[PDB]
Design a protein around this nucleic acid. Sequence first.
RNA 1: GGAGGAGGAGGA
RNA 2: GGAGGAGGAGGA
Lengths: 12, 12
Amino acid sequence: GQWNKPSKPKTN
Amino acid sequence: GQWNKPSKPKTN
RNA sequence: GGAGGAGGAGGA
RNA sequence: GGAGGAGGAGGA
């Protein structure tokens, strides 16, 4: 139950 | 047991 | 560090 | 959402 489940939208 | 233990130096 | 999504700028 | 501290920009 976190952020976007390693599907990083801009890869950081 | 968190970040800066709300002695907040950067306001956030 | 997955117990929260308050948040994308850390990556687990 | 306090147990990670990889991070400081949420702030509870």
